mmCIF file of C-alpha atoms and ligand atoms in Angstrom:
data_model
loop_
_atom_site.group_PDB
_atom_site.id
_atom_site.type_symbol
_atom_site.label_atom_id
_atom_site.label_comp_id
_atom_site.label_asym_id
_atom_site.label_seq_id
_atom_site.Cartn_x
_atom_site.Cartn_y
_atom_site.Cartn_z
ATOM 1 C CA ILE A 9 0.000 0.000 0.000
ATOM 2 C CA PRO A 10 2.099 2.930 -1.291
ATOM 3 C CA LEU A 11 -0.227 5.375 0.500
ATOM 4 C CA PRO A 12 0.729 7.471 3.552
ATOM 5 C CA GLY A 13 -0.705 6.532 6.931
ATOM 6 C CA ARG A 14 -2.783 9.352 8.412
ATOM 7 C CA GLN A 15 -4.805 9.956 11.551
ATOM 8 C CA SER A 16 -6.957 12.879 12.603
ATOM 9 C CA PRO A 17 -5.288 15.170 15.178
ATOM 10 C CA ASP A 18 -8.529 15.032 17.197
ATOM 11 C CA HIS A 19 -8.429 11.236 17.519
ATOM 12 C CA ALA A 20 -7.944 11.206 21.312
ATOM 13 C CA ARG A 21 -11.042 13.260 22.094
ATOM 14 C CA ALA A 22 -13.086 11.238 19.591
ATOM 15 C CA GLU A 23 -12.057 7.942 21.141
ATOM 16 C CA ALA A 24 -12.686 9.219 24.686
ATOM 17 C CA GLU A 25 -16.247 10.325 23.850
ATOM 18 C CA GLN A 26 -17.127 7.486 21.471
ATOM 19 C CA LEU A 27 -19.572 5.809 23.898
ATOM 20 C CA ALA A 28 -21.881 8.748 24.591
ATOM 21 C CA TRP A 29 -23.700 8.448 21.258
ATOM 22 C CA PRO A 30 -24.482 4.684 21.091
ATOM 23 C CA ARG A 31 -25.528 4.774 24.760
ATOM 24 C CA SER A 32 -27.932 7.694 24.354
ATOM 25 C CA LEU A 33 -29.539 5.883 21.405
ATOM 26 C CA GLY A 34 -29.936 2.571 23.247
ATOM 27 C CA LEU A 35 -27.411 0.714 21.091
ATOM 28 C CA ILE A 36 -25.193 -0.131 24.085
ATOM 29 C CA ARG A 37 -27.069 -0.915 27.277
ATOM 30 C CA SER A 38 -24.545 -2.636 29.598
ATOM 31 C CA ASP A 39 -21.058 -1.915 30.870
ATOM 32 C CA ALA A 40 -19.897 -5.213 29.373
ATOM 33 C CA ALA A 41 -21.260 -4.205 25.971
ATOM 34 C CA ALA A 42 -19.492 -0.856 26.340
ATOM 35 C CA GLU A 43 -16.156 -2.565 27.028
ATOM 36 C CA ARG A 44 -16.657 -4.913 24.071
ATOM 37 C CA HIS A 45 -17.332 -1.841 21.922
ATOM 38 C CA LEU A 46 -14.167 -0.110 23.193
ATOM 39 C CA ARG A 47 -12.154 -3.204 22.288
ATOM 40 C CA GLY A 48 -13.165 -2.845 18.640
ATOM 41 C CA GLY A 49 -11.051 0.274 18.095
ATOM 42 C CA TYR A 50 -13.850 1.887 16.094
ATOM 43 C CA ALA A 51 -13.056 5.547 16.766
ATOM 44 C CA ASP A 52 -9.421 4.758 16.020
ATOM 45 C CA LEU A 53 -10.552 3.320 12.682
ATOM 46 C CA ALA A 54 -12.736 6.360 11.960
ATOM 47 C CA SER A 55 -9.839 8.703 12.780
ATOM 48 C CA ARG A 56 -7.846 6.918 10.072
ATOM 49 C CA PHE A 57 -10.670 6.800 7.501
ATOM 50 C CA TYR A 58 -11.268 10.526 8.164
ATOM 51 C CA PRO A 59 -7.933 12.141 9.133
ATOM 52 C CA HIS A 60 -9.232 15.411 7.644
ATOM 53 C CA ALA A 61 -12.148 15.514 10.089
ATOM 54 C CA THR A 62 -12.194 16.920 13.623
ATOM 55 C CA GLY A 63 -14.867 17.776 16.159
ATOM 56 C CA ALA A 64 -18.472 17.039 15.219
ATOM 57 C CA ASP A 65 -17.439 15.946 11.709
ATOM 58 C CA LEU A 66 -15.183 13.230 13.134
ATOM 59 C CA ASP A 67 -17.779 12.243 15.738
ATOM 60 C CA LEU A 68 -20.134 11.549 12.833
ATOM 61 C CA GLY A 69 -17.530 9.237 11.333
ATOM 62 C CA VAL A 70 -16.964 7.549 14.695
ATOM 63 C CA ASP A 71 -20.707 7.020 15.097
ATOM 64 C CA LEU A 72 -20.811 5.487 11.612
ATOM 65 C CA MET A 73 -18.093 2.982 12.511
ATOM 66 C CA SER A 74 -19.829 2.384 15.849
ATOM 67 C CA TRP A 75 -23.193 1.854 14.149
ATOM 68 C CA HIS A 76 -21.921 -0.461 11.418
ATOM 69 C CA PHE A 77 -20.344 -2.976 13.781
ATOM 70 C CA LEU A 78 -23.276 -2.870 16.210
ATOM 71 C CA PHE A 79 -25.541 -3.438 13.191
ATOM 72 C CA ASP A 80 -23.496 -6.233 11.625
ATOM 73 C CA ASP A 81 -23.457 -8.074 14.964
ATOM 74 C CA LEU A 82 -27.278 -8.398 14.865
ATOM 75 C CA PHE A 83 -26.835 -10.915 12.015
ATOM 76 C CA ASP A 84 -24.213 -13.133 13.659
ATOM 77 C CA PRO A 86 -29.689 -17.135 13.283
ATOM 78 C CA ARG A 87 -31.256 -13.995 11.772
ATOM 79 C CA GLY A 88 -28.323 -13.916 9.345
ATOM 80 C CA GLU A 89 -29.200 -17.481 8.332
ATOM 81 C CA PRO A 91 -33.227 -14.087 4.393
ATOM 82 C CA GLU A 92 -36.756 -13.259 5.519
ATOM 83 C CA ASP A 93 -35.788 -12.316 9.072
ATOM 84 C CA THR A 94 -32.757 -10.412 7.759
ATOM 85 C CA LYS A 95 -34.866 -8.371 5.329
ATOM 86 C CA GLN A 96 -37.417 -7.623 8.050
ATOM 87 C CA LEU A 97 -34.757 -5.825 10.074
ATOM 88 C CA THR A 98 -33.046 -4.158 7.086
ATOM 89 C CA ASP A 99 -36.328 -2.738 5.742
ATOM 90 C CA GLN A 100 -36.970 -1.122 9.130
ATOM 91 C CA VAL A 101 -33.530 0.483 9.069
ATOM 92 C CA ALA A 102 -33.548 1.416 5.372
ATOM 93 C CA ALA A 103 -36.958 3.029 5.979
ATOM 94 C CA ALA A 104 -35.098 5.930 7.613
ATOM 95 C CA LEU A 105 -33.830 6.922 4.148
ATOM 96 C CA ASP A 106 -37.411 7.582 2.956
ATOM 97 C CA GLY A 107 -38.655 9.582 5.951
ATOM 98 C CA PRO A 108 -39.158 9.692 9.723
ATOM 99 C CA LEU A 109 -39.239 6.377 11.543
ATOM 100 C CA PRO A 110 -42.045 5.283 13.867
ATOM 101 C CA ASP A 111 -41.111 5.410 17.542
ATOM 102 C CA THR A 112 -41.577 1.628 17.604
ATOM 103 C CA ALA A 113 -38.577 1.145 15.306
ATOM 104 C CA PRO A 114 -35.748 -0.839 16.917
ATOM 105 C CA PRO A 115 -32.921 1.205 18.444
ATOM 106 C CA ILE A 116 -30.478 0.199 15.697
ATOM 107 C CA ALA A 117 -32.848 1.886 13.205
ATOM 108 C CA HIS A 118 -33.126 5.104 15.210
ATOM 109 C CA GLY A 119 -29.334 5.044 15.337
ATOM 110 C CA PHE A 120 -28.956 4.833 11.570
ATOM 111 C CA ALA A 121 -31.561 7.591 11.185
ATOM 112 C CA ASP A 122 -29.530 9.857 13.452
ATOM 113 C CA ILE A 123 -26.424 9.194 11.365
ATOM 114 C CA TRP A 124 -28.261 9.692 8.060
ATOM 115 C CA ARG A 125 -29.882 12.914 9.300
ATOM 116 C CA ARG A 126 -26.433 14.316 10.080
ATOM 117 C CA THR A 127 -24.913 12.900 6.884
ATOM 118 C CA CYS A 128 -27.228 14.796 4.526
ATOM 119 C CA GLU A 129 -27.538 18.228 6.126
ATOM 120 C CA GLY A 130 -25.475 20.684 4.106
ATOM 121 C CA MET A 131 -24.949 18.386 1.109
ATOM 122 C CA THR A 132 -26.614 18.811 -2.270
ATOM 123 C CA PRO A 133 -29.869 16.846 -2.735
ATOM 124 C CA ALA A 134 -28.270 14.839 -5.554
ATOM 125 C CA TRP A 135 -25.419 13.810 -3.248
ATOM 126 C CA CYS A 136 -28.004 12.723 -0.660
ATOM 127 C CA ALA A 137 -29.961 10.681 -3.208
ATOM 128 C CA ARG A 138 -26.786 8.977 -4.415
ATOM 129 C CA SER A 139 -25.639 8.296 -0.855
ATOM 130 C CA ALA A 140 -29.109 6.904 -0.130
ATOM 131 C CA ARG A 141 -28.791 4.445 -3.028
ATOM 132 C CA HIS A 142 -25.452 3.300 -1.619
ATOM 133 C CA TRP A 143 -27.119 2.519 1.697
ATOM 134 C CA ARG A 144 -29.919 0.557 0.003
ATOM 135 C CA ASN A 145 -27.253 -1.429 -1.848
ATOM 136 C CA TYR A 146 -25.644 -2.076 1.540
ATOM 137 C CA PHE A 147 -28.894 -3.211 3.153
ATOM 138 C CA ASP A 148 -29.751 -5.323 0.099
ATOM 139 C CA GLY A 149 -26.349 -6.989 0.419
ATOM 140 C CA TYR A 150 -27.238 -8.330 3.867
ATOM 141 C CA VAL A 151 -30.391 -9.922 2.447
ATOM 142 C CA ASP A 152 -28.387 -11.403 -0.446
ATOM 143 C CA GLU A 153 -25.719 -12.782 1.894
ATOM 144 C CA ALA A 154 -28.398 -14.426 4.044
ATOM 145 C CA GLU A 155 -29.689 -16.274 0.967
ATOM 146 C CA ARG A 173 -19.526 -9.166 -0.701
ATOM 147 C CA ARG A 174 -18.803 -5.878 -2.453
ATOM 148 C CA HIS A 175 -21.902 -4.408 -0.753
ATOM 149 C CA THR A 176 -21.879 -5.889 2.769
ATOM 150 C CA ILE A 177 -18.352 -4.530 3.327
ATOM 151 C CA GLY A 178 -19.877 -1.050 3.368
ATOM 152 C CA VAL A 179 -16.857 0.651 1.843
ATOM 153 C CA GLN A 180 -18.955 3.025 -0.281
ATOM 154 C CA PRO A 181 -20.957 4.514 2.642
ATOM 155 C CA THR A 182 -17.629 4.867 4.462
ATOM 156 C CA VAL A 183 -16.250 6.765 1.471
ATOM 157 C CA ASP A 184 -19.434 8.843 1.218
ATOM 158 C CA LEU A 185 -18.987 9.934 4.844
ATOM 159 C CA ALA A 186 -15.444 11.134 4.106
ATOM 160 C CA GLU A 187 -17.013 13.658 1.698
ATOM 161 C CA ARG A 188 -19.507 14.775 4.332
ATOM 162 C CA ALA A 189 -16.858 14.843 7.065
ATOM 163 C CA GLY A 190 -14.665 16.960 4.799
ATOM 164 C CA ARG A 191 -17.596 19.169 3.686
ATOM 165 C CA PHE A 192 -16.824 18.670 -0.004
ATOM 166 C CA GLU A 193 -18.341 16.727 -2.889
ATOM 167 C CA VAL A 194 -16.400 15.180 -5.750
ATOM 168 C CA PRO A 195 -18.013 16.342 -9.031
ATOM 169 C CA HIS A 196 -20.913 13.981 -9.551
ATOM 170 C CA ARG A 197 -20.086 13.389 -13.213
ATOM 171 C CA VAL A 198 -16.594 12.309 -12.200
ATOM 172 C CA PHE A 199 -17.990 10.078 -9.444
ATOM 173 C CA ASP A 200 -19.817 8.202 -12.216
ATOM 174 C CA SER A 201 -16.769 8.125 -14.502
ATOM 175 C CA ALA A 202 -15.424 4.765 -15.572
ATOM 176 C CA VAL A 203 -12.058 5.742 -14.047
ATOM 177 C CA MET A 204 -13.369 6.690 -10.604
ATOM 178 C CA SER A 205 -15.688 3.680 -10.661
ATOM 179 C CA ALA A 206 -12.629 1.471 -11.197
ATOM 180 C CA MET A 207 -10.766 3.224 -8.367
ATOM 181 C CA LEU A 208 -13.694 2.722 -5.988
ATOM 182 C CA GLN A 209 -13.940 -0.932 -7.010
ATOM 183 C CA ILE A 210 -10.272 -1.379 -6.057
ATOM 184 C CA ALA A 211 -10.973 0.221 -2.676
ATOM 185 C CA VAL A 212 -13.808 -2.274 -2.148
ATOM 186 C CA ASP A 213 -11.831 -5.332 -3.283
ATOM 187 C CA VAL A 214 -8.781 -4.383 -1.199
ATOM 188 C CA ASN A 215 -10.932 -3.871 1.894
ATOM 189 C CA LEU A 216 -12.632 -7.175 1.126
ATOM 190 C CA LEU A 217 -9.360 -9.113 0.895
ATOM 191 C CA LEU A 218 -7.716 -7.555 3.963
ATOM 192 C CA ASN A 219 -10.799 -8.350 6.048
ATOM 193 C CA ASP A 220 -11.065 -12.005 4.988
ATOM 194 C CA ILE A 221 -7.343 -12.471 5.624
ATOM 195 C CA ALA A 222 -7.923 -11.074 9.107
ATOM 196 C CA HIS A 254 -2.107 -15.065 -3.821
ATOM 197 C CA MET A 255 -4.548 -12.753 -2.053
ATOM 198 C CA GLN A 256 -1.597 -10.508 -1.212
ATOM 199 C CA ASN A 257 -0.649 -10.507 -4.902
ATOM 200 C CA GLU A 258 -4.210 -9.515 -5.784
ATOM 201 C CA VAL A 259 -3.877 -6.624 -3.327
ATOM 202 C CA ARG A 260 -0.535 -5.589 -4.847
ATOM 203 C CA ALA A 261 -1.793 -5.827 -8.431
ATOM 204 C CA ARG A 262 -4.911 -3.801 -7.595
ATOM 205 C CA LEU A 263 -2.875 -1.131 -5.797
ATOM 206 C CA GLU A 264 -0.505 -0.839 -8.751
ATOM 207 C CA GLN A 265 -3.570 -0.467 -10.971
ATOM 208 C CA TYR A 266 -4.937 2.067 -8.486
ATOM 209 C CA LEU A 267 -1.854 4.244 -9.092
ATOM 210 C CA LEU A 268 -2.225 3.870 -12.870
ATOM 211 C CA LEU A 269 -5.848 5.001 -12.557
ATOM 212 C CA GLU A 270 -4.816 7.894 -10.315
ATOM 213 C CA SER A 271 -2.501 9.206 -13.022
ATOM 214 C CA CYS A 272 -5.421 9.439 -15.477
ATOM 215 C CA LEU A 273 -7.282 11.884 -13.234
ATOM 216 C CA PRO A 274 -5.693 15.049 -14.708
ATOM 217 C CA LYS A 275 -7.025 13.887 -18.085
ATOM 218 C CA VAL A 276 -10.379 12.874 -16.564
ATOM 219 C CA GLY A 277 -10.701 16.388 -15.142
ATOM 220 C CA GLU A 278 -10.351 17.995 -18.563
ATOM 221 C CA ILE A 279 -12.633 15.444 -20.266
ATOM 222 C CA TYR A 280 -15.402 16.523 -17.852
ATOM 223 C CA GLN A 281 -14.281 20.181 -18.010
ATOM 224 C CA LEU A 282 -13.723 20.644 -14.288
ATOM 225 C CA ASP A 283 -13.251 24.219 -13.148
ATOM 226 C CA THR A 284 -10.853 25.086 -10.314
ATOM 227 C CA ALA A 285 -13.133 24.277 -7.364
ATOM 228 C CA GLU A 286 -14.224 20.998 -8.941
ATOM 229 C CA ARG A 287 -10.603 20.041 -9.572
ATOM 230 C CA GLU A 288 -9.805 20.685 -5.900
ATOM 231 C CA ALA A 289 -12.854 18.679 -4.800
ATOM 232 C CA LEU A 290 -11.731 15.771 -6.971
ATOM 233 C CA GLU A 291 -8.272 15.977 -5.411
ATOM 234 C CA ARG A 292 -9.771 15.992 -1.905
ATOM 235 C CA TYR A 293 -11.815 12.945 -2.904
ATOM 236 C CA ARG A 294 -8.694 11.140 -4.103
ATOM 237 C CA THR A 295 -6.644 11.817 -0.964
ATOM 238 C CA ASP A 296 -9.209 12.122 1.863
ATOM 239 C CA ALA A 297 -11.862 9.580 0.800
ATOM 240 C CA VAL A 298 -10.503 6.920 -1.562
ATOM 241 C CA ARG A 299 -6.897 6.747 -0.377
ATOM 242 C CA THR A 300 -7.946 6.883 3.273
ATOM 243 C CA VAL A 301 -10.453 4.037 2.925
ATOM 244 C CA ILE A 302 -7.698 1.933 1.351
ATOM 245 C CA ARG A 303 -4.873 2.809 3.742
ATOM 246 C CA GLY A 304 -6.890 3.360 6.927
ATOM 247 C CA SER A 305 -8.232 -0.183 6.834
ATOM 248 C CA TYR A 306 -4.709 -1.626 6.578
ATOM 249 C CA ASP A 307 -3.234 0.484 9.388
ATOM 250 C CA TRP A 308 -6.217 -0.400 11.590
ATOM 251 C CA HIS A 309 -5.399 -4.126 11.495
HETATM 252 C C1 FDF B 1 -13.367 -4.463 8.732
HETATM 253 C C2 FDF B 1 -14.674 -4.668 7.975
HETATM 254 C C3 FDF B 1 -15.776 -5.104 8.645
HETATM 255 C C4 FDF B 1 -17.127 -5.343 7.986
HETATM 256 O O1 FDF B 1 -17.867 -6.407 8.591
HETATM 257 P P1 FDF B 1 -17.899 -7.849 7.856
HETATM 258 O O2 FDF B 1 -18.021 -7.649 6.360
HETATM 259 O O3 FDF B 1 -19.082 -8.644 8.365
HETATM 260 O O4 FDF B 1 -16.544 -8.662 8.176
HETATM 261 P P2 FDF B 1 -16.123 -9.081 9.677
HETATM 262 O O5 FDF B 1 -17.192 -9.981 10.253
HETATM 263 O O6 FDF B 1 -15.958 -7.848 10.535
HETATM 264 O O7 FDF B 1 -14.812 -9.823 9.602
HETATM 265 C C5 FDF B 1 -14.834 -4.413 6.473
HETATM 266 C C6 FDF B 1 -14.374 -3.024 6.024
HETATM 267 C C7 FDF B 1 -14.950 -1.899 6.863
HETATM 268 C C8 FDF B 1 -15.162 -0.651 6.373
HETATM 269 C C9 FDF B 1 -14.818 -0.316 4.932
HETATM 270 C C10 FDF B 1 -15.743 0.350 7.361
HETATM 271 C C11 FDF B 1 -16.829 -0.238 8.251
HETATM 272 C C12 FDF B 1 -18.044 -0.530 7.404
HETATM 273 C C13 FDF B 1 -19.090 0.320 7.340
HETATM 274 C C14 FDF B 1 -20.306 0.020 6.489
HETATM 275 F F1 FDF B 1 -21.318 0.921 6.674
HETATM 276 C C15 FDF B 1 -19.017 1.589 8.153
HETATM 277 F F2 FDF B 1 -20.245 2.176 8.327
#
């Protein structure tokens, strides 16, 4: 992984306060569950996925890591299709509007993350981020019956929100960026299953660099102005690179 290791300078405060949010939302209800959460290193992981984030922006990324692992654990008999989809639909419902008070705590937790994720972003970014979540939830149903259950894309999406920028949407959809994001997903997929595959990681990372060098040309093809060029650069270094490197340094 020829990418620099990076960690937010606010990582210590974020890790110290990481329990207040899942406790106030009923996701963690016992001191033993709290300790098990602390042992995951989830704020540490967020501080590496989002080194450019501090304060409330990094707390949102910590909550997202917190929520994902609390959520994934709910499928460790339910995870063996109908019962899986019954939970996912209740969570995914938060994307379409307010949840009923009867919704399980894990769904009110996602809704609180999603509410904070969208505020201040363009509606089109929200809609696209919402589709990524549905693909994530659909992946759990498909697994019960991997590029979607890993949840790399919503992690990447949060890096944009935590950095208060948006990569130009027409470059997000580009064949080049789509190939870069696929590498990020595959690399995260291989490193997690390990925790020949190492060669596949090395080959993909070498291809990742090749794809990175096309981005100056991609920017002109889509006629990026100055701000859009800087957003694309922030996306390359603070969202894609960080989701590739941060996962490795975490393990
Ligand atoms: C480490 C990792 C965990 C994802 O969980 P699993 O796919 O079930 O594997 P595991 O049982 O933990 O061995 C995969 C990569 C994680 C990320 C890219 C960030 C966490 C995932 C999110 C999805 F939404 C964060 F919200």
